[PDB]
Amino acid sequence: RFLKVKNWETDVVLTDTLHLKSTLETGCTEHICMGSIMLPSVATKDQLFPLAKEFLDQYYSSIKRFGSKAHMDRLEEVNKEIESTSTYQLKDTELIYGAKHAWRNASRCVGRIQWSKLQVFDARDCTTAHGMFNYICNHVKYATNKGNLRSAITIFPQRTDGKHDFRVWNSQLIRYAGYKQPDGSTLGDPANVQFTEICIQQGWKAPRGRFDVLPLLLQANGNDPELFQIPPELVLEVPIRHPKFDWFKDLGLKWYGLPAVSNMLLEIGGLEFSACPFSGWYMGTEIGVRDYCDNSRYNILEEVAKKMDLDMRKTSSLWKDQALVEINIAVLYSFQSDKVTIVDHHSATESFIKHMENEYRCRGGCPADWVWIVPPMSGSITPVFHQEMLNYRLTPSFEYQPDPWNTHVWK
Amino acid sequence: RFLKVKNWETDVVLTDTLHLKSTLETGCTEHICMGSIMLPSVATKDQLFPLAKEFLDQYYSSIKRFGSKAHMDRLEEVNKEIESTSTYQLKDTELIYGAKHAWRNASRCVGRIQWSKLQVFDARDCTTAHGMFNYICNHVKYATNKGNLRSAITIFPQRTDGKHDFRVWNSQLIRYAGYKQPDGSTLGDPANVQFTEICIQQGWKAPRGRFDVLPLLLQANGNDPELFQIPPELVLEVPIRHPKFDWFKDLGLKWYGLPAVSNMLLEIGGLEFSACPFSGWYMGTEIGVRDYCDNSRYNILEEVAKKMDLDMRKTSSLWKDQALVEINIAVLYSFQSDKVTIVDHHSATESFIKHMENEYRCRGGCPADWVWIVPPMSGSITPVFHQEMLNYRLTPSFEYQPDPWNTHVWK
Ligand code: HEM
Ligand code: HEM
Ligand SMILES: CN(C)CCc1cc(F)c(F)c(CCc2cc(C(F)F)cc(N)n2)c1
Ligand SMILES: CN(C)CCc1cc(F)c(F)c(CCc2cc(C(F)F)cc(N)n2)c1
Ligand SMILES: C[C@H](O)[C@H](O)[C@H]1CNc2nc(N)[nH]c(=O)c2N1
Numbered sequence: 001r002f003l004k005v006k007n008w009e010t011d012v013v014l015t016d017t018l019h020l021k022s023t024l025e026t027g028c029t030e031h032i033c034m035g036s037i038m039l040p041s042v043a044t045k046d047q048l049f050p051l052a053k054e055f056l057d058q059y060y061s062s063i064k065r066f067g068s069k070a071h072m073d074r075l076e077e078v079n080k081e082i083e084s085t086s087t088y089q090l091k092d093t094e095l096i097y098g099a100k101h102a103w104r105n106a107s108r109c110v111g112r113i114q115w116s117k118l119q120v121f122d123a124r125d126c127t128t129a130h131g132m133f134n135y136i137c138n139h140v141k142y143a144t145n146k147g148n149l150r151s152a153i154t155i156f157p158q159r160t161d162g163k164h165d166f167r168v169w170n171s172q173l174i175r176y177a178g179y180k181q182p183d184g185s186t187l188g189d190p191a192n193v194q195f196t197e198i199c200i201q202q203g204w205k206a207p208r209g210r211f212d213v214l215p216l217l218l219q220a221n222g223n224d225p226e227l228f229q230i231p232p233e234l235v236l237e238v239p240i241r242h243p244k245f246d247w248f249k250d251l252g253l254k255w256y257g258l259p260a261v262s263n264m265l266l267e268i269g270g271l272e273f274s275a276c277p278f279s280g281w282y283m284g285t286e287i288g289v290r291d292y293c294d295n296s297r298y299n300i301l302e303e304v305a306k307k308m309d310l311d312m313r314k315t316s317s318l319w320k321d322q323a324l325v326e327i328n329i330a331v332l333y334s335f336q337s338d339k340v341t342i343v344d345h346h347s348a349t350e351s352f353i354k355h356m357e358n359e360y361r362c363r364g365g366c367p368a369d370w371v372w373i374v375p376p377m378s379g380s381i382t383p384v385f386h387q388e389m390l391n392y393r394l395t396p397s398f399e400y401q402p403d404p405w406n407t408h409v410w411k
Numbered sequence: 412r413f414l415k416v417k418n419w420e421t422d423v424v425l426t427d428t429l430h431l432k433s434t435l436e437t438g439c440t441e442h443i444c445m446g447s448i449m450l451p452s453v454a455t456k457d458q459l460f461p462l463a464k465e466f467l468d469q470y471y472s473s474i475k476r477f478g479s480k481a482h483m484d485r486l487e488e489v490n491k492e493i494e495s496t497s498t499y500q501l502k503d504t505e506l507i508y509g510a511k512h513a514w515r516n517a518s519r520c521v522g523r524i525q526w527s528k529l530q531v532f533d534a535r536d537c538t539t540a541h542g543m544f545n546y547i548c549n550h551v552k553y554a555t556n557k558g559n560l561r562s563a564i565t566i567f568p569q570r571t572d573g574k575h576d577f578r579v580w581n582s583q584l585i586r587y588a589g590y591k592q593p594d595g596s597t598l599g600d601p602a603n604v605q606f607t608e609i610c611i612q613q614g615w616k617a618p619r620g621r622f623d624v625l626p627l628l629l630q631a632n633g634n635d636p637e638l639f640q641i642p643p644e645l646v647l648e649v650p651i652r653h654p655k656f657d658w659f660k661d662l663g664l665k666w667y668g669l670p671a672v673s674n675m676l677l678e679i680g681g682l683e684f685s686a687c688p689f690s691g692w693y694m695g696t697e698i699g700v701r702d703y704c705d706n707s708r709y710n711i712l713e714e715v716a717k718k719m720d721l722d723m724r725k726t727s728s729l730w731k732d733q734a735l736v737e738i739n740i741a742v743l744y745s746f747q748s749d750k751v752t753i754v755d756h757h758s759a760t761e762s763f764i765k766h767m768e769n770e771y772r773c774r775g776g777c778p779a780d781w782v783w784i785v786p787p788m789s790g791s792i793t794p795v796f797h798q799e800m801l802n803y804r805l806t807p808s809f810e811y812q813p814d815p816w817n818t819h820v821w822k
């Protein structure tokens with residue numbers, strides 16, 4: 001019941017007891033492991049109070065005030081409010097604690113060594129999509145910090161009934177558009193082709209090019225979502241050049257500095273925050289490997305290998321691999337030269353092992369999803385490849401949610 | 412109960428019903444996924460007959476003779492023999508069927524597209540370590556086929572009581588020795604340092620160099636294991652050169668052509684075969700990435716990067732990654748130029764997806780362990796990265812077993 005995980009590079013053994021506190025379910029059974037399924041799968045007042053009590057019990061235990069009167073009263077105070085309202089409201093300090101621990105508990109996130117330094121923006125007084133725009137703009141400006149990126153999250157009002165939901169319809173705050181061509185090909189980011197068409201459907205005048213920063217599509221309190229263009233001065237972008245190959249600039253590649261996921265759901269003491277955009281900084285491989293070299297994304301291995309003069313006839317020339325390393329040297333070099341925060345998969349994975357050691361000592365474990373933690377290139381020359389990881393679901397948490405354009409009853 | 416797995420590169424969906432036939436347990440629960448734990452964890456006559464019946468029921472169903480008289484008699488015949496002997500003996504055709512399906516069911520094996528073309532050598536009449544040597548020698552010669560490698564397995568007598576076990580103490584038939592130095596460093600393969608010392612303890616005159624092919628250490632019917640040197644003409648080796656870098660030959664690297672695991676246990680209808688060395692051919696990354704570049708193995712990224720003239724000061728120069736690709740181009744190129752069978756991770760992973768499609772149609776699924784299937788470099792530019800895989804344990808199977816030098820009551 002007190003499980004051991006081993007590092008097979010260093011022979012370090014850590015003991016996990018935190019998984020005992022785990023509540024949610026993983027999708028796996030004794031007879032089938034679903035560790036590689038990508039997206040495994042109202043709320044009544046009866047369900048709400050154990051979840052609030054559970055959350056408050058760990059909140060007061062963390063500020064070294066577990067079981068005191070100020071605890072019990074808050075416990076009673078929330079009990080009474082759930083009786084009277086069939087929901088309840090977090091104190092500001094509980095919101096900050098909750099959001100930081102949703103990130104701390106995100107088993108697929110390799111960046112969690114920084115989980116305690118998260119800037120929480122309370123947008124729970126917001127009522128209009130224009131207000132969301134204003135908040136998201138302030139978030140972007142703050143998080144970007146002129147390239148000295150800072151972790152942040154902005155938390156819009158919690159779900160109530162379920163038909164009054166705040167949603168950022170964008171999957172990320174800053175994403176490049178994707179347009180299907182007449183000849184079937186795709187310009188820009190193929191991932192966003194559908195969302196790009198939703199913005200056009202709502203009146204976005206697309207500059208039909210490569211790296212067109214999409215507009216924000218914001219839904220307030222269940223209403224129809226509204227388009228807003230982020231002031232370009234707030235969208236920090238990095239032109240991608242190589243420290244050796246001067247033809248690399250002529251590729252005309254660039255990326256945005258700020259990774260900021262906006263489609264996920266934050267759960268805190270049973271309260272659901274449907275719009276909670278959060279941002280950090282990139283690990284290079286997210287751009288260099290997946291964004292640029294996924295077959296169904298920008299898919300630039302072809303052109304980079306052509307310009308590298310590579311034996312592209314055979315599979316075993318490893319021309320794909322060789323061009324992949326150059327592309328990731330270039331992403332990292334471009335970001336660093338522009339003083340835009342970025343971490344390489346070697347630095348980030350070493351930090352995660354050091355993070356894991358901290359969490360096993362002062363917390364009893366660290367839920368971790370190996371499938372997502374190991375980088376998409378050079379896996380085994382990073383320390384996380386050789387690290388056994390227990391995956392389990394703790395709360396507060398970030399959860400997936402349906403895309404709003406399947407759920408939303410339009411007008 | 413009829414689960415779906417998706418490919419996120421191609422949007423192909425397959426439906427798994429084979430997991431219903433699964434019997435063993437995975438280590439995961441509804442509350443904790445152990446998909447990244449490396450080694451998760453006598454036999455009575457009551458337990459034996461359901462396992463025999465289960466196996467025979469699928470054997471006759473596969474030669475299109477399920478439930479016939481020849482089935483029922485074999486069923487009765489094995490029932491009677493388990494009553495009378497508290498164990499039983501497989502027909503030759505059942506041994507071949509069993510061994511092929513142990514490989515077919517090996518969820519961590521990416522090479523399984525070839526599972527039906529396995530050459531099974533029945534060594535169940537063997538009685539002495541000298542006899543094992545003779546059989547293993549014939550296996551090596553056959554499997555090597557002068558570089559045109561052929562899949563094979565040699566099956567020594569099944570376990571009976573448990574103190575009369577046949578064991579190949581070697582983890583693989585052909586492995587390089589590893590010697591700890593006076594200054595603490597390691598010459599050769601650090602993985603084998605302990606086993607290398609066991610061979611010296613038993614009288615092996617080590618040529619204390621790099622790539623010293625270890626001797627076979629063979630235990631027959633529970634007796635003390637005996638040393639045998641494989642005739643060097645049977646050990647096919649590949650000197651590693653690069654198609655560009657002529658200094659690469661001066662690295663003095665080489666590897667053996669034949670991967671042949673010898674420490675695992677084959678389970679067929681409840682019968683345990685403790686010595687069942689099996690061989691195929693290498694995927695390049697096994698050598699180029701793990702053998703050569705694991706920190707706790709040969710660990711040659713340092714020297715290769717030095718000779719490549721690489722910015723080794725910073726982590727984010729990706730000098731490790733860049734040297735890793737060159738090393739794997741070289742392994743592949745050297746093997747192919749010598750006409751020694753080898754597959755690149757691009758060819759092998761594409762074959763495994765094609766293998767998966769075959770198994771989902773004509774079998775209802777394919778147990779697969781993503782953590783092991785995805786190659787240790789360039790993961791996401793291979794199709795298996797984007798393939799959801801269900802892992803579950805089917806039988807016949809290859810299982811891990813304790814190393815014999817912890818179990819063996821010596822003389
Ligand atoms: C500070 C720098 C950060 C880095 C370097 C980082 C890195 C990563 C990476 C590489 C992934 C893999 C998922 C993918 O490849 O798309 C990931 C996932 C994730 N990140 Fe982090 N991240 C950072 C900050 C944050 C912050 C501030 C939050 C929340 C406040 C967060 C929440 C998450 C979540 C919830 C996931 C998992 C999504 C899922 O469950 O599928 N990250 N991160
Ligand atoms: C024919 C060419 C073959 C190729 C290219 C191949 C490739 C691989 C690779 C890359 C692994 C990953 C494990 C590691 O990295 O050490 C593996 C595992 C494995 N292979 Fe295959 N293999 C082949 C043939 C065979 C054969 C003939 C058998 C049995 C008769 C077999 C049985 C296994 C088993 C049981 C494992 C998993 C060990 C475990 O459960 O941890 N393989 N294979
Ligand atoms: C399969 N795809 C669609 C999953 C989508 C997806 C969902 C997530 F929750 C998620 F975090 C990511 C990583 C991007 C990312 C986010 C952050 C954070 F600060 F915002 C930092 C960072 N470095 N990278 C991707
Ligand atoms: C963590 N380590 C110690 C696990 C050891 C280990 C156990 C195994 F069963 C296993 F198959 C391997 C792969 C080697 C291999 C084997 C074969 C086959 F034909 F023999 C073919 C191939 N290409 N590669 C490694
Ligand atoms: C099929 C598989 O689950 C899927 O491709 C996963 C694999 N691991 C990943 N890991 C990260 N970090 N990001 C991803 O999108 C994925 N995709």
Ligand SMILES: C[C@H](O)[C@H](O)[C@H]1CNc2nc(N)[nH]c(=O)c2N1
Nearest residue numbers: 385386387388447448449782783
């Ligand atoms: C911790 C982790 O389970 C371990 O390092 C695994 C990861 N995946 C692997 N995959 C393969 N093919 N071979 C391995 O040895 C490993 N090692």
Ligand SMILES: [Zn+2]
Nearest residue numbers: 033439444445
């Ligand atoms: Zn699992």
